[PDB]
């Protein structure tokens, strides 16, 4: 019984509970957290340097995601 | 030009992110705040779930 974590908006949680039922799954623990969301802009050439320092600064938590 | 990315951090890290952003010629285009529910789930590797999770969310939900 592998464990994972899942981050979701509150209005989606009961839907997650329901899907879990169709895999005999269970909710281990729950928490509530506020985060600041940033939309940033930098040159293509600096993305790696930024992403690297961003990992060092955040002990590997912070993840820079692309906008498609 | 300049490429755009999104980023999620707790409040106490933002200013560091801003400082680093300055060191690489970066700019903040937008900021916002959002509360989320963090779930710790326990399923068998039916891990089907991810596919249904994708349909349910339109690609935006990520199992970690």
């Amino acid at each position, epitope marked *: 019984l592998t464990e994972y974590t899942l981050q979701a908006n509150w209005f989606d949680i*009961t839907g997650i509970l*329901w899907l879990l039922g169709q895999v005999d799954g269970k909710i281990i623990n729950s928490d*509530v957290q506020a985060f600041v969301l940033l939309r940033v802009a930098l040159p293509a050439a600096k993305v790696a340097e930024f992403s690297a320092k961003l990992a060092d600064f955040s002990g590997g938590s912070l993840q820079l995601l692309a906008i498609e | 030009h300049l490429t755009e990315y999104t980023l999620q951090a707790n409040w106490f890290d933002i200013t560091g992110i801003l400082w680093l952003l300055g060191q690489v010629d970066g700019k903040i285009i937008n900021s916002d705040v959002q509360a989320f529910v963090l779930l710790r789930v326990a399923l068998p590797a039916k891990v089907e779930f991810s596919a249904k999770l994708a349909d349910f*969310s339109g690609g935006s939900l990520q199992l970690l």
Partner: antibody, heavy 126, light 110 residues
Framework: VQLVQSGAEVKRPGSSVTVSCKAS????????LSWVRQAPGRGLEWMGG????????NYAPRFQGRITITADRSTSTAYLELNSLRPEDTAVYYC????????????????????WGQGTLVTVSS | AEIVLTQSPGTQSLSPGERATLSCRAS???????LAWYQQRPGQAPRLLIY???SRPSGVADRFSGSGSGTDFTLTISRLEPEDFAVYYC?????????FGQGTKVEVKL
């Protein structure tokens, strides 16, 4: 799925009111119940909610600190506690529960509110 | 943020049988098309017509249809019955802070 709310109430500035909402029909713990209100002649306004099974609450910032939403799995009953009543709180408070896909009570949760209480008027008067 | 939903028109008058086209526009993109439409008749509680921007729930007449995505949404009443004369609300629940539009009133023309 019926939801029945406590009767009208008349309160004084600074006081408190608790409105009850009792569900009958299908399961109760696995659906998001919310409280929505409407001042006289004005629009609907989402205040907050609870998912009973997980005891997870979610309040709109405007009311964060003044509002407590609780659930009682034994009686299938949600409660709205609103504190420091001001006269701008005068309104009809409706409880509202998300529906489920398909007919039958056991479908997929949809988030949007398909089931509503008759509403409860709270008057705050000096 | 507190996504503002602007409904238009504010009030409009139509005849029984005519087609109603209601607009709800979001200040920010709406998460996973989670936009709902409600009908509120005088003195009643609101009633759910559409969810997921375009999906119809159990028991809602076929004359009600929803469309749009992102920031621009539309409710369409193909042919107004007497009971369709009411106030209509949009709501977004695509983030944890949900919000409603200010409502569009559809009244009888004459």
């Amino acid at each position: 799925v019926q939801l029945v709310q406590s009767g009208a109430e008349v309160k004084r500035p600074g006081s408190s009111v608790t409105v009850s909402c009792k569900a009958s029909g299908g399961s109760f713990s696995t659906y998001a119940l919310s409280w929505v209100r409407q001042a006289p002649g004005r629009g609907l306004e989402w205040m907050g909610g609870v998912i009973p099974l997980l005891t997870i609450t979610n309040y709109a910032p405007r009311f964060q600190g003044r509002i407590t939403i609780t659930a009682d799995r034994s009686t299938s009953t949600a409660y709205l506690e609103l504190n420091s009543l001001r006269p701008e709180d005068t309104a009809v408070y409706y409880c509202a529960r998300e529906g489920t896909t398909g007919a039958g009570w056991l479908g997929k949760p949809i988030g949007a509110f398909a089931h509503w209480g008759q509403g409860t008027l709270v008057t705050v008067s000096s | 943020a507190e996504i503002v939903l602007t409904q238009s028109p504010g009030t409009q008058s139509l005849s029984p049988g005519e087609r109603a086209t209601l607009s709800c526009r979001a200040s920010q993109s709406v998460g996973n098309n989670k936009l709902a439409w409600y009908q509120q008749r005088p003195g009643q509680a609101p009633r759910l017509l559409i969810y997921g921007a375009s999906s119809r729930p159990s028991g809602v007449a076929d004359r009600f249809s929803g469309s749009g995505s992102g920031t621009d949404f539309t409710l369409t009443i193909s042919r107004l019955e007497p009971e369709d004369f009411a106030v209509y609300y949009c709501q977004q629940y695509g983030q944890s802070l949900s919000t409603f539009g200010q409502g569009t009133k559809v009244e009888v023309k004459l």
